Amino acid sequence: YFQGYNEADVAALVRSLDRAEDHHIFAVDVLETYPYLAESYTKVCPRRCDLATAAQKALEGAYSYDLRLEGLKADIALMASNCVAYNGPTSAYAETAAKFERYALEQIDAFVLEHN
């Protein structure tokens, strides 16, 4: 009968995943920053997410009922997967994507261990 994680705590966890080290490229929707990529980018990435959308989702209770924040991890994995796919696995920001995902997953697992 898990009670669920506090929405504001999950939203602050999400906000903390937006790093200057990653040049803030996961902070905002890619098509909001570059509207003319819509056709080309949606062909490679039919699903998108970003940390401003994930923070707003966290405040709606989208992730609060997952015991190990599985839904948030899938949204983080989508962000990193799209970056690797669109830019290329040997691109410089595909390495940033793998580091971001690894950092984010450690911060999520730490949150779950703290709020248990």
Ligand X SMILES: CC[C@@H]1C(=O)N(C)c2cnc(Nc3ccc(C(=O)NC4CCN(C)CC4)cc3OC)nc2N1C1CCCC1
**Contacting residue, 10, 30, 51, 72, with ligand X by CB under 6 A:** 30
- By the rule CB under 6 A, 77 interacts with ligand X: no
| Number of chain residues interacting with ligand X (CB under 6 A) | 11
Closer to ligand X by Cβ: residue 69 or 83: 83
DSSP 5-42: --HHHHHHHHHTT--TTTTTTTSS-HHHH-GGGHHHHH
Site string for ligand X, 52-71 (x = CB under 6 A): --------------------
The span from the CA of 85 to the CA of 50, in Å, is 15
Residue nearest to ligand X (CB): 24
The span from the CA of 99 to the CA of 79, in Å, is 12
